[PDB]
Each structure stands twice: as structure tokens, then as C-alpha cells.
Scaffold this active site. Structure first.
Site, PDB file in Angstrom:
ATOM      1  N   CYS A   1      37.373  30.537  54.989  1.00 28.97           N
ATOM      2  CA  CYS A   1      38.779  30.738  54.648  1.00 28.97           C
ATOM      3  C   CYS A   1      39.528  31.363  55.824  1.00 28.97           C
ATOM      4  O   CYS A   1      38.946  32.131  56.583  1.00 28.97           O
ATOM      5  CB  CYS A   1      38.939  31.555  53.369  1.00 28.97           C
ATOM      6  SG  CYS A   1      38.053  30.872  51.946  1.00 28.97           S
TER       7      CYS A   1
ATOM      8  N   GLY B   1      33.227  31.966  53.765  1.00 28.49           N
ATOM      9  CA  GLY B   1      33.465  32.567  55.072  1.00 28.49           C
ATOM     10  C   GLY B   1      34.402  31.740  55.944  1.00 28.49           C
ATOM     11  O   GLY B   1      34.916  32.247  56.952  1.00 28.49           O
TER      12      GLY B   1
ATOM     13  N   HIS C   1      43.748  36.447  49.671  1.00 28.47           N
ATOM     14  CA  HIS C   1      42.577  36.739  48.818  1.00 28.47           C
ATOM     15  C   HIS C   1      41.494  37.586  49.550  1.00 28.47           C
ATOM     16  O   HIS C   1      40.544  38.009  48.906  1.00 28.47           O
ATOM     17  CB  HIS C   1      41.983  35.487  48.136  1.00 28.47           C
ATOM     18  CG  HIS C   1      41.218  34.575  49.044  1.00 28.47           C
ATOM     19  ND1 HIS C   1      41.655  33.288  49.303  1.00 28.47           N
ATOM     20  CD2 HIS C   1      40.068  34.790  49.720  1.00 28.47           C
ATOM     21  CE1 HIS C   1      40.761  32.767  50.129  1.00 28.47           C
ATOM     22  NE2 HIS C   1      39.792  33.634  50.410  1.00 28.47           N
TER      23      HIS C   1
HETATM   24  C1  LIG Z   1      33.090  29.117  48.543  1.00 21.78           C
HETATM   25  C2  LIG Z   1      34.077  28.396  49.425  1.00 21.78           C
HETATM   26  C3  LIG Z   1      33.706  27.247  50.112  1.00 21.78           C
HETATM   27  C4  LIG Z   1      34.657  26.542  50.826  1.00 21.78           C
HETATM   28  N1  LIG Z   1      35.938  26.912  50.917  1.00 21.78           N
HETATM   29  C5  LIG Z   1      36.301  28.036  50.292  1.00 21.78           C
HETATM   30  C6  LIG Z   1      35.419  28.805  49.532  1.00 21.78           C
HETATM   31  N2  LIG Z   1      35.852  29.948  48.835  1.00 21.78           N
HETATM   32  C7  LIG Z   1      36.564  29.917  47.693  1.00 21.78           C
HETATM   33  O1  LIG Z   1      36.999  28.887  47.197  1.00 21.78           O
HETATM   34  C8  LIG Z   1      36.761  31.264  47.045  1.00 21.78           C
HETATM   35  C9  LIG Z   1      37.920  32.135  47.595  1.00 21.78           C
HETATM   36  C10 LIG Z   1      38.797  31.521  46.482  1.00 21.78           C
HETATM   37  C11 LIG Z   1      39.701  32.444  45.835  1.00 21.78           C
HETATM   38  C12 LIG Z   1      40.507  31.979  44.663  1.00 21.78           C
HETATM   39  C13 LIG Z   1      41.183  32.276  45.960  1.00 21.78           C
HETATM   40  C14 LIG Z   1      37.502  31.276  45.684  1.00 21.78           C
END
Ligand SMILES: Cc1ccncc1NC(=O)[C@H]1C[C@H](C2CC2)C1
Ligand SMILES: Cc1ccncc1NC(=O)[C@H]1C[C@H](C2CC2)C1
EC number: 3.4.19.12
Lengths: 304, 304
Positions: free
Chosen positions: A145, A143, A41
Site C-alpha cells: 500500500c 506492505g 489506513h
Molecule cells: C493484503 C493486501 C494485498 C494487496 N493489496 C493490499 C492489501 N491490503 C489490504 O487490502 C488491507 C488494507 C486495507 C484497508 C481497508 C483499507 C485492507
């Protein structure tokens, strides 16, 4: 003595964390040998995330669009490919800090450490368990991920998890290092609800053995039970059904303490039926299920 | 989202762990620059530990009696000295992995990470707090002495603790990196009882702000209190008295959530008086006091 939610030392994993930027999205990558692993992603824009077609999105990306930085130095990208929900960026330099490693897909109930990272930089380390509904109760912000979950056997790091997303309920979803999501989650900005989060029974029992080993014995009773009687109770309280496989793994703990596994199940049953009555076990007022029987043995013996 | 007992990444500290052997006792040493820091009780035999005279014991020891091994390689000891309850072994090689570091003596209530080690090898990392009675509720076995406690500010490691002993109650005692014990404990095999372990009020409040930030709000009430009214309640439940200094440090959390510090104190007061009523806050059934206001801000912002 003392029993703590302990994570593996994270140094070997810190040496693998890099920052991957694609367009205007920056997340974490795992650099092992000459390959950088990151969530696919990274190629998405906000509009793309609603219903992304990763194959179509990846067509418009070249090796030079993926910016990989390890510390303050740039890595040259000589190849890119998609394996399920992870991108593999072939770089021209093998990571000099690459430890002995394996990619393992864990089962729910198993525990691991998470090195939470932001911009390729580690912020902290904590211990997690893959929940029976295939989610993890982590601590991740935007951030984070690409942050990974791992276990260590002496010098070998077994990478088991890569963080991909937060579900609308604040719980976390991700993949193994082959890009396959744990559970039924998809890397898309769509509401995906988690299933029943049952308690990992074998882990609670292992933690009860850890408590006996460290002095907390008030919960020990004069009763016993059977696997079928215990499982009737476990079903009522949304506890995982205990099998003879689980009993087998508790064997070393049962042997050390001299408390038969079914005797400990009877103690657990009374705790489920009566609660703690304002008391604590290992400084916890609830039943802890994120210590496997292996973690208890490891911590109580001092495995390095 | 999600809130976890997070430790600092331990890599920078792993690179400093060495094994120190004197006679038949082996424990952990901290190698920074050309100096190895370890507990002085390494020179003691079992009979010596009852009533040791470290100055007298050290007379019979030469540089060649202290065996320092970093990984599988031996360090040459060219000097030795005693500074309070720590021995400083001057080695002929500066540690190539020495990070930017400081030696700090923390105050009770402050938190830190512990890299538990055995035979100079790291076994795990966990987060701790210096209790108001100057003990730590760690996880240490025989061989873990010399394991250190630390905090990290970007690239600088502030070493604050070195493990020395377990009290007969299973709690832990140790020194700062200048060899001075936290609390009134002495490095001697004699029964030393710990004082009242009060709860770190400012930390519980910081954790309540972390809970509001992450979704757990059930405990918020329509009440407020005063510092003196709150402190009457805090005294009854063996909570540390809250000062205006503590209120000042909660300021950034109060600002982010929009909940005045005294309003959160009223929520804490009702929680002390009524209990949780079977509910949880951040997956905990008791009030957590091992997150400082700084840790909450750091974790909730993603400081690396
Ligand atoms: C905001 C956040 C906070 C903690 N862990 C992860 C995140 N990020 C996400 O969940 C975003 C990237 C995802 C895409 C669908 C793949 C949506
Ligand atoms: C057995 C153990 C377990 C955990 N932490 C530490 C220990 N070790 C001790 O407490 C020993 C060395 C102490 C000497 C008086 C200085 C007595």
C-alpha cells in the site's frame, strides 16, 4: 519491431519512495517536495479496519507518531493532515530527488506504470490499465500500500494512482494523489464487489494496429462495419461502446497503416464472433486491451 | 495477489545510459566506472555493414571520433578498445551514478529486464527471456542498439545483455557485456535465421505454480506422470526437456502449494494435449514461459 507490455522507466519514482510507519503498520509513502503522501489506513489497527472513523483515529496521532524513513535516514515530521483517503506528512526536508510532477485523475481505459514497493523499497515495475469498473489488475501483497501509478511526459511524472486495497476477488483498489478513490470503494475491511469488467474497445483496436505495424496481419478481413453495427457486437461481448472520440484518437494509427478505423472494427467484430482459432496476435492468444492508442504510437515511434 | 510480467526497477540502469556517436551513427552506451560499453557496429557506415572488418574500420578511428554524451554533458574519451563485438571507451570521468554491478552471461530460459533507450535516453522497461534459440522477443527500433538487459539482487545490477540487431524475422540478437553474442549470430547485415523457438518448460511450470498460488486452479487434475513420460509429450509440442535440475528448482513452489512437481507436469501434459478450451490462466490464453521459478518466488514473496 516487436511489441511489448512496456512500463515507463521508474527511476524518477524510485527517488520518491519512502517508508511510513504508524504504530505497528508500515506501508509506502511518496515524498515530493516537503510532503509525504501515504494511505490514511496507516493509522489503523486490525480491529479499527472493520469500521474505522479516520477523523477520530487521527485525533490520537501526533507528528512524532508518523515515522518516515527514506533509505536509511529519518525524516522529521512537522505537520500532518488528511485529504480524503490520503495523509500528507509535512517533513522539514524537501526531497532532493523530486522530479517535475503533476497529480492527475485518470479515466478508465487509460494505462499507467506501477512501481510496486515494500518498506519504501521498490520490488518491480509493470504496466496497468484503470479498468472500466475502476479496479486495477495489479500484483500487490501486504506492505505494498502506498505504491504509486504514474505516466511520464519527457521529464514530468504525472502521478495518477496510489494503492490502498485488495478486494476479496484479488483485484486492486486505490486513489488518485488527492485521496479520492477510483470507483465506489471505501478504505474499510468490508466486502466490496467489483462491477462488470468490460473490455476497453479503443485499446484493443490500437493493439490491432500495433499488430499490423509489426507483421501480424492474418486477422485482416475484406469487411467493414458502422459504429452502430459494431457497438451491437461490442455490447454482446461486454466490450466498451466505441464513440467518434475513440475513432478520432485512432486517427494517427489509421493514417500510418492505411486501414480505416471502421475496417479495423470489422476485423475486431469477426475476431469476437469467431475467436482466434488457435492463432496468436503479438504473441497473445486473447485480445489485449491495456495499450492505449497513445502507447502504441509512443512505442512504435520510440518516444523517450 | 495478482501476477504480472514485472520488470526490475530501472533507476540504477537509467543513471548509466549515455549516447555514443561515431561519424553519423548514434546508439546507446553503458557508462560504468570510467568505461563506456557500446556495440562495435557504431563505427560502421551503411556500405560497411554488408561485410564489415571491424579491426580495419577501427584503425581509422581515434578517441576524438567517439562522441559520448551523458544527459547534456560531454565525456572526454581517453582510450578505446574492442572486446569481441563491444567497444570500450575509456572516459576521464567515472560515472557518479555507477551502481554495484557484475557482468554475467545468462543461459537460455533465464529472464531479465530491458531498459529500451534511444539517444542515451530511456523510453521504457520490459521483462524478457533469453529464448532457447538465443534470440530475445524484444521491442526495439533503429537507435535502440546499446540498450541493456539486466537483473538486480538488492543493490547489485547484473548486466547480462546488450542489444545489437534485429533479425529479418523481427526477433532480436545481442551480446553479453563482454561482447560475445548469444547464439550463433554475427554483427553483420546478412540474413541469419533463428533456430527452433522451443518453450521453456521449467518456466511454464513455475507460472502454473504462480497461478495456483493466486487462485487459478481449474487446470489441476487427478493425474501424475514420470519425467520420461512427460518428456515424450514435451518433445511433441517443442517444449524443452525437463531435467531433475529443473525439478529441484521448482522445489520451493512445490513445497508452498503442496503439489508435487510431477503432478504439475501431468497438469501441463493435459493442457498441451487438450488446450485451454477457451479458458485463461493468470489472464493469459496461452502457456506463459517468461517467468523463472526464481521470479515466481520473488514476486509471490515481495523481494525488494
Ligand atoms: C493484503 C493486501 C494485498 C494487496 N493489496 C493490499 C492489501 N491490503 C489490504 O487490502 C488491507 C488494507 C486495507 C484497508 C481497508 C483499507 C485492507
Ligand atoms: C533496425 C533495428 C531495429 C531493432 N534493433 C536493431 C536494429 N538495427 C539493426 O539490426 C542494424 C544494426 C545491425 C548491424 C549488423 C550489426 C543492423
Amino acid at each position: 519491431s516487436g511489441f511489448r507490455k512496456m512500463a515507463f522507466p521508474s527511476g524518477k519514482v524510485e527517488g520518491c519512495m519512502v517508508q511510513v510507519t504508524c504504530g505497528t503498520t508500515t506501508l509506502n509513502g511518496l515524498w515530493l517536495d516537503d510532503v509525504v503522501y501515504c494511505p490514511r489506513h496507516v493509522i489503523c489497527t486490525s480491529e479499527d479496519m472493520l469500521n474505522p472513523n479516520y477523523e477520530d483515529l487521527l485525533i490520537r496521532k501526533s507528528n512524532h507518531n508518523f515515522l518516515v524513513q527514506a533509505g536509511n535516514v529519518q525524516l522529521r515530521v512537522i505537520g500532518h493532515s488528511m485529504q480524503n483517503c490520503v495523509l500528507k506528512l509535512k517533513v522539514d526536508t524537501a526531497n532532493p530527488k523530486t522530479p517535475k510532477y503533476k497529480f492527475v485523475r485518470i479515466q478508465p481505459g487509460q494505462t499507467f506504470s506501477v512501481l510496486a514497493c515494500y518498506n519504501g523499497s521498490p520490488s518491480g515495475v509493470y504496466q496497468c490499465a484503470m479498468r472500466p469498473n475502476f479496479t486495477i489488475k495489479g500484483s500487490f501483497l501486504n506492505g505494498s500500500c502506498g505504491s504509486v501509478g504514474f505516466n511520464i511526459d519527457y521529464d514530468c511524472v504525472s502521478f495518477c494512482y496510489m494503492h490502498h486495497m485488495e478486494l476479496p476477488t484479488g483485484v486492486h483498489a486505490g486513489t488518485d494523489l488527492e485521496g479520492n478513490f477510483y470507483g465506489p470503494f471505501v478504505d474499510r475491511q468490508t466486502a466490496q464487489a467489483a462491477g462488470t469488467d468490460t473490455t476497453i474497445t479503443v485499446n484493443v483496436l490500437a493493439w490491432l494496429y500495433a499488430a499490423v505495424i509489426n507483421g501480424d496481419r492474418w486477422f485482416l478481413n475484406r469487411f467493414t462495419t458502422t459504429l452502430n453495427d459494431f457497438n451491437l457486437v461490442a455490447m454482446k461481448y461486454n466490450y466498451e461502446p466505441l464513440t467518434q472520440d475513440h475513432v478520432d484518437i485512432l486517427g494517427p494509427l489509421s493514417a500510418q497503416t492505411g486501414i480505416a478505423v471502421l475496417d479495423m472494427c470489422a476485423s475486431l467484430k469477426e475476431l469476437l464472433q469467431n475467436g482466434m482459432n488457435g492463432r496468436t496476435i503479438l504473441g497473445s492468444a486473447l485480445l489485449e486491451d491495456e495499450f492505449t492508442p497513445f502507447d502504441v504510437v509512443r512505442q512504435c515511434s520510440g518516444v523517450t
